[PDB]
Enzyme design. Structure first.
Site, mmCIF file in Angstrom:
data_model
loop_
_atom_site.group_PDB
_atom_site.id
_atom_site.type_symbol
_atom_site.label_atom_id
_atom_site.label_comp_id
_atom_site.label_asym_id
_atom_site.label_seq_id
_atom_site.Cartn_x
_atom_site.Cartn_y
_atom_site.Cartn_z
ATOM 1 N N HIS A 112 95.856 51.695 45.842
ATOM 2 C CA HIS A 112 96.491 51.941 47.079
ATOM 3 C C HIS A 112 97.843 52.513 47.184
ATOM 4 O O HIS A 112 98.510 52.747 48.002
ATOM 5 C CB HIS A 112 96.549 50.845 48.081
ATOM 6 C CG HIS A 112 95.002 50.640 48.660
ATOM 7 N ND1 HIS A 112 94.593 49.262 49.240
ATOM 8 C CD2 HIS A 112 93.835 51.126 48.244
ATOM 9 C CE1 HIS A 112 93.399 49.469 49.309
ATOM 10 N NE2 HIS A 112 92.861 50.571 48.876
ATOM 11 N N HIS B 92 84.760 53.692 43.267
ATOM 12 C CA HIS B 92 83.320 53.512 43.926
ATOM 13 C C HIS B 92 82.303 53.400 43.064
ATOM 14 O O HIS B 92 81.360 52.720 43.069
ATOM 15 C CB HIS B 92 83.269 54.328 45.153
ATOM 16 C CG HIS B 92 83.890 53.948 46.417
ATOM 17 N ND1 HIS B 92 83.459 54.149 47.546
ATOM 18 C CD2 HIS B 92 85.265 53.322 46.398
ATOM 19 C CE1 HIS B 92 84.376 53.530 48.398
ATOM 20 N NE2 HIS B 92 85.310 53.024 47.952
HETATM 21 C C1 HEM Z 1 89.567 44.606 48.580
HETATM 22 C C2 HEM Z 1 88.986 45.854 48.094
HETATM 23 C C3 HEM Z 1 89.281 47.267 48.645
HETATM 24 C C4 HEM Z 1 89.030 47.660 49.908
HETATM 25 C C5 HEM Z 1 88.563 46.783 51.046
HETATM 26 C C6 HEM Z 1 89.210 48.989 49.902
HETATM 27 C C7 HEM Z 1 89.439 50.120 50.921
HETATM 28 C C8 HEM Z 1 89.574 51.319 51.498
HETATM 29 C C9 HEM Z 1 89.378 52.087 52.516
HETATM 30 C C10 HEM Z 1 88.868 51.437 53.913
HETATM 31 C C11 HEM Z 1 89.857 53.411 52.191
HETATM 32 C C12 HEM Z 1 89.794 54.532 52.899
HETATM 33 C C13 HEM Z 1 88.511 55.463 52.979
HETATM 34 C C14 HEM Z 1 89.013 56.600 53.900
HETATM 35 O O1 HEM Z 1 89.427 56.378 55.097
HETATM 36 O O2 HEM Z 1 89.209 57.865 53.328
HETATM 37 C C15 HEM Z 1 90.331 53.513 50.871
HETATM 38 C C16 HEM Z 1 90.787 54.393 50.008
HETATM 39 C C17 HEM Z 1 91.439 54.427 48.723
HETATM 40 N N1 HEM Z 1 91.204 53.646 47.833
HETATM 41 FE FE1 HEM Z 1 90.686 51.499 48.484
HETATM 42 N N2 HEM Z 1 89.580 49.751 48.631
HETATM 43 C C18 HEM Z 1 89.646 48.366 47.889
HETATM 44 C C19 HEM Z 1 90.003 48.770 46.531
HETATM 45 C C20 HEM Z 1 90.433 49.853 45.678
HETATM 46 C C21 HEM Z 1 90.673 49.560 44.255
HETATM 47 C C22 HEM Z 1 90.552 48.456 43.446
HETATM 48 C C23 HEM Z 1 90.996 50.836 44.034
HETATM 49 C C24 HEM Z 1 91.175 51.624 42.531
HETATM 50 C C25 HEM Z 1 92.027 50.977 41.589
HETATM 51 C C26 HEM Z 1 91.336 51.913 45.221
HETATM 52 C C27 HEM Z 1 91.596 52.965 45.603
HETATM 53 C C28 HEM Z 1 91.885 53.814 46.929
HETATM 54 C C29 HEM Z 1 92.454 55.406 46.725
HETATM 55 C C30 HEM Z 1 93.030 56.367 45.801
HETATM 56 C C31 HEM Z 1 92.024 55.603 47.911
HETATM 57 C C32 HEM Z 1 92.805 56.536 48.955
HETATM 58 C C33 HEM Z 1 91.647 57.800 49.085
HETATM 59 C C34 HEM Z 1 91.846 58.822 49.591
HETATM 60 O O3 HEM Z 1 93.453 59.117 49.735
HETATM 61 O O4 HEM Z 1 91.310 59.838 49.841
HETATM 62 N N3 HEM Z 1 90.834 50.848 46.387
HETATM 63 N N4 HEM Z 1 90.182 52.148 50.570
#
Ligand code: HEM
Ligand code: HEM
EC number: 1.11.1.21
Lengths: 714, 714
Positions: free
Chosen positions: A242, A79
């Site tokens: 993810h 972010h």
């Molecule tokens: C189309 C682009 C993407 C969308 C729409 C998106 C979406 C989201 C949403 C909705 C969450 C959950 C927030 C939450 O409820 O805790 C999340 C978390 C997460 N995202 Fe994505 N993200 C995107 C891309 C990316 C990229 C490019 C990375 C890093 C290489 C990343 C990594 C992560 C990680 C590790 C978490 C999990 C956080 C946790 O377990 O607390 N994301 N994302």
């Protein structure tokens, strides 16, 4: 009681506060503070050791999922860097501005206030030796490494900002999580890096909250492209990220989460989104409103995301938080993942509409299949993309510090070659200077060329500038604003001088075209001042080198192409917003103050360095003579101004007491006599005792811009 | 296209931008620019000659009424100084901010853009030698003089600002010419100088637009009072001013005047209120919407206004502009005045509801009658009131420059006596400091006393400060916040030291109580630093003197009494705004930046300089020791904060795990851990390598505040 800004009473008022931000440096830190020097004193490995310990040190006010904060930190880092826009180089992780409003309060940054808070003890321990900006990225790398994946490398060098970047226009919307920037997916308003106000890239539920993966892909592609990433990089980043963690949405955030940070109670001390019925949590955390993990082992690097996505069919549904999410059709994945906090509960994997988009879109699907078949390819692409993502706004290799900087320099760093010769000295400097003034090149030609070379610099992401002489390469050599055929004439003469000089050398001394460009403009300015009766010597710094097309990503420079250029009085015939607004925006990229910009514009008009050599704003009878004529004539009430019929940005200055036309100008010239603050500046420079001051101020600003990209000694 | 401010998203967000203005001098002027020194080079007489020449030099784009611009200029100077408020000393002519939004576009300042424009040629001719601020007042003076009335005097020294005063709260209204500040005449929201948003003092038609003379008088009295003027001064000013010129309203302004300056087309070049019939049309001129002269000879000083008002009966009516105004009930005044532009035409005198108010209101009536019977007195009072009006925010006599400054010093200048003795030297300075510390006064007492003396200063009108030692006189010696009983003891001890030092000198040296107060403060800060293990030397400048009650207008100092004092953690239990808002407001009066304010509060809390010696915000186990403990403990997440039951200002800091009550604080202390920008500053000072930095920064700020009112040595 809060002073009602003039912005409220008059929405069309120019935002000069962004230029006042350049006047000085906000913050308790000195003005001569060299962060680079401080970071070099840092023991990087000791910070990484403390970060690795933190990964599993769960704090009761925000319990670590699966006993490991790693995934949270990755999201935090992603972010931080994910707000970057190629259009202006703004946004991004370089200043760690995620810590300030409005970014610290965006819906998409919910609970990252807790993530950053977990790093406070480490930040405090190392103090100035490591900035918040460098620390947040390092925290992400350490998370990734601790969970089984080797990173491509890491560089320090990101100096902390102490407030929001006021120049950034995040969108037209008046409410977060709403969008008024696109009618059809893939057709988002130019500039913007996200499809919805308050989000990093796109809506995780689908365009306009509709679970349409195919349409989602259109916005994913466009937003990531606007953030410098292609199809392969995009898929690698999404799948790579993810592979870790989960999304949180035990219940609807709308009716269960308290005020965002900026609007939260003072006692919460900077934290926000406090659960209506909660303050810490785990098995009931709420962030995005979507609930569940992507893989069976959320804290281990593996092929879990790719396999779950591609090996099973998914179907859309409303989750426990009332948001769109996808569930597997097979029963094998049922309760296949341990709960984040309850050791005796299980959970079923889930996918976001944006993940399914990678499987549904033909292009992304081709990439994903390749990744599944070749894990090593997947991993490498993710390692490289993550490095690019997090360092994309740091500039050239000279700015990358620390023992973890990779041996390999990447093309997006717009690398510069080392000088394989001796730098010219005072004697040669004068030698070349004389030769340039002797050529058939005019003062205007030399000034326009040197400006075209240095004016592409962006303090936002450190891209552009005169070093490298990329002006002679694609795509710059063919930009309309640079007048291709005209530029070729100037460059040919300068390249002819470069040749004769180097060939006439006996020792090992040589000169680059990049230095000649700047030397030419400097000599031209000193000449313009001399023609006005002022003797000035502009400081010169030799050392610039000539970059080659091999290490130049031409397409990526398209983002630096200007639509408006005040100095050259160039204004594209289709700009959406007013010209002066763009003028102020671009001036901020050059770290200019309101007074500097004014001196620069006025001084340039007396020289006559206009695009296509027009007389727009050239209110003088002595062309190529540096004086304050622009201001004197602009302020003369003996002239009356009126919009030129059949012209969008054109105006005519007519004799008032009569009606004959005297001048031709653009909104760029007239803003300095219309805006209250700019007019006060013009009045100073247009006084009968200010010509010398304008001359010297013009020179100070000219010199500053010529040296913006010289980090060789920063 | 403009970036939405954070203020817009979160209306209650602290307006730190006001403090950012103190961290920079916007404008093209050099950093070492001394306006006083530049004004001294000016030939004031030559400027006055040029101004008198202008009075009768009618310009076609804005024809002069009765062939004399004098009245227009008087109004311009009157409005420039008329926005002054005694509450915070802000507004006024000292900075000539009438040139910037929102003031430049207030309805009441209509067409004054034309007035200032007429002065541009003169301004340009003399350049830096005379500021717009000084020139606007000078123009009003020359206009008055040229029409038969010698002014009491004139002083230059008003340095031009280059932006609006962001710290000023002009009122709650969201629309101009509307009022949401009073529900009954004379009961205007405190802190405001006008009864209506966008007007200087009151509505010329009467309260809420009703022609009620008596009601109008109530608002006139209160507004003028809040602008430091009494009954006699008020009547003199209004009567004297309306002895010249006329009101302009040939037609409805709400229909025939174009957009105000800030909203006008760029081609207007800073002008506004374009007449839909042509500005050159003197007969169609429209400004306030009211039409007609007050007297028979608008360009001559005489008893015409008073005679017309008191000698004839007036009745309410609607003018050609559709606004309420008064006309003679008789007929001997009909067409008794020549037309302002038509040689072969006449016009009947008129009165505004605000003028009739001076006749209806009993107190005002008495003054007017006395004036009519004693024209000499009317002149004497007007002359002195005009001088006061236009110089009230310039500070002490030391700041009044020029050959036209009267020999007499007025009590409203808060004058200081001369030091009829030699100043103390280095050795005496060191001796006195040692002696003070050796006394029975604690570090805390000395710091609190020095702050009490210096914290009254305000950069807005240059009032207050430690010079003069007025802390020991009414009303300050008895302000609740200064703890009268405690104060008398401290000052008693210091006075005894002064006496013994003076009696022991064998030469002509002497020390003032004013200097002793500040030196003991410095000594205490140095001691506190020493207790923490740091050797610091606070720069001390001797020269302050002791002022007496004879030249102290006690009542006028009431406006300087604080409702909130962060340094002493004092919060009056009846404030309307959140404590932190007042804090920022007050910090700006001291010219402090965000970082300076933070270092100050943080440092003061480790010292323990609270009102009534409470432990509020004193987050340390070593009182009277200058350290960074405030920041370390404030930022410790091991502590949770919650509002205190049965207490409107206290908060308790408890151990998150043990429930132990560790600290107590107010919003003043907590804001530094809540606001996003202040939190970033606190994190710097709270680092393990920043205690020394905090000490130096605290000392620089302390030293800065102590010398704010040192004009004598400039
Ligand atoms: C189309 C682009 C993407 C969308 C729409 C998106 C979406 C989201 C949403 C909705 C969450 C959950 C927030 C939450 O409820 O805790 C999340 C978390 C997460 N995202 Fe994505 N993200 C995107 C891309 C990316 C990229 C490019 C990375 C890093 C290489 C990343 C990594 C992560 C990680 C590790 C978490 C999990 C956080 C946790 O377990 O607390 N994301 N994302
Ligand atoms: C209760 C306070 C006052 C009210 C509401 C007020 C009223 C007004 C209005 C409605 C106008 C006419 C604007 C125009 O149409 O051109 C005017 C102008 C005028 N005022 Fe007053 N004023 C007050 C007091 C003062 C003071 C204290 C002075 C200065 C010592 C003065 C100065 C003048 C002069 C010289 C003019 C006429 C300008 C001209 O001929 O262009 N006024 N005023």
């Amino acid at each position: 009681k809060r002073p009602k800004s003039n912005q409220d009473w008059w929405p069309s008022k120019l935002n000069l506060e962004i230029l006042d931000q350049n006047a000085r440096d906000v913050g308790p830190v000195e003005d001569d503070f060299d962060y680079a020097e401080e970071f070099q004193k840092l023991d990087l490995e000791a910070v990484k050791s403390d970060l690795e310990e933190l990964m599993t040190s769960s704090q009761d006010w925000w319990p670590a999922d699966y006993g490991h904060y790693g995934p949270l930190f990755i999201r935090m880092a992603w972010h931080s860097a994910g707000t970057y826009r190629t259009a202006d180089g703004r946004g991004g992780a370089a200043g760690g501005r995620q810590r300030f409003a409005p970014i610290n309060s965006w819906p998409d940054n919910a609970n990252l206030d807790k993530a950053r808070r977990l790093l406070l003890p480490i930040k405090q321990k190392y103090g100035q030796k490591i900035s918040w900006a460098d620390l947040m990225i390092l925290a992400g790398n350490v998370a990734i490494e601790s969970m089984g994946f080797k990173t491509f490398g890491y560089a320090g060098g990101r100096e902390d900002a102490f407030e929001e970047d006021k120049a950034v226009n995040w969108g037209p919307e008046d409410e977060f999580e709403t969008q008024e920037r696109f009618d059809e997916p893939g057709e988002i308003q130019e500039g913007l890096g996200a499809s919805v106000m308050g989000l990093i890239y796109v809506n995780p539920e689908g365009p306009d909250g509709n679970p349409d993966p195919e349409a989602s892909a259109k916005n994913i592609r466009q937003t990531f492209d606007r953030m410098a990433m292609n199809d392969k990089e995009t898929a690698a980043l999404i799948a790579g990220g993810h592979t870790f963690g989960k999304v949180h949405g035990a219940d609807d955030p709308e009716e269960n989460l308290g005020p965002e940070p900026e609007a939260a109670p003072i006692e919460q001390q900077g934290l926000g989104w406090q659960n209506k019925n909660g303050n810490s949590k785990g098995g009931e955390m709420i962030t995005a409103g979507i609930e569940g993990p992507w893989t069976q082992s959320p804290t281990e690097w593996d092929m879990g995301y790719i396999n779950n996505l591609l090996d099973y069919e998914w179907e859309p549904e409303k989750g426990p938080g009332g948001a769109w999410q996808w569930a597997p059709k097979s029963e094998e994945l049922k309760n296949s993942v341990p709960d984040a906090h309850d050791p005796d509960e299980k959970q079923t994997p889930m996918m976001l509409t944006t993940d399914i988009a990678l499987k549904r879109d033909p292009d992304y699907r081709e990439v994903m299949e390749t990744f599944q078949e070749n894990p090593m390819e997947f991993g490498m692409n993710f390692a490289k993309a993550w490095y690019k993502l997090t360092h994309r706004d740091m500039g050239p290799p000279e700015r990358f510090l620390g023992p973890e900087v990779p041996d390999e320099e990447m093309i997006w760093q717009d690398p510069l070659p080392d000088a394989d010769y001796d730098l010219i000295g005072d004697e040669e400097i004068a030698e070349l200077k004389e030769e340039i003034l002797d050529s058939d090149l005019s003062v205007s030609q030399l000034v326009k060329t040197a400006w075209a070379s240095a004016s592409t610099y962006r303090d936002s992401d450190k891209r552009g500038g005169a070093n490298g002489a990329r002006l002679r390469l694609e795509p710059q050599k063919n930009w309309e604003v640079n007048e291709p055929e005209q530029l070729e004439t100037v460059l040919g003469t300068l390249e002819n001088i470069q040749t004769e000089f180097n060939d006439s050398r006996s020792d090992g001394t040589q000169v680059s075209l990049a230095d000649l460009i700047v030397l030419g403009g400097n000599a031209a300015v000193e000449q313009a001042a001399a023609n006005a009766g002022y003797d000035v010597e502009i400081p010169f710094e030799p050392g610039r080198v000539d970059a080659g097309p091999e290490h130049t990503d031409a397409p990526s420079f398209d983002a630096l192409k200007p639509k408006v250029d005040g100095v050259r009085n160039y204004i594209q015939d289709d700009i959406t917003r007013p010209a002066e607004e763009v003028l102020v925006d671009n001036a901020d990229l050059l770290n200019l103050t309101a007074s500097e910009l004014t001196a620069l514009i006025g001084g340039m008009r007396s020289i006559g360095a206009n695009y296509q050599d027009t007389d727009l704003g050239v209110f003088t009878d002595e062309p190529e003579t540096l004086t304050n004529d622009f201001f004197v004539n602009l302020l003369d009430m003996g002239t009356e101004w009126e919009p030129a019929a059949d012209s969008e940005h054109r105006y005519k200055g007519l004799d008032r007491d009569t009606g004959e036309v005297k001048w031709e100008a653009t909104r760029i010239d007239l803003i300095f006599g219309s805006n209250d603050r700019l007019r006060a500046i013009s009045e100073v420079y247009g006084s009968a005792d200010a010509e010398k001051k304008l001359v010297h101020d013009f020179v100070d600003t000219w010199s500053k811009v010529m040296k913006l990209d010289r980090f060789d000694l920063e």
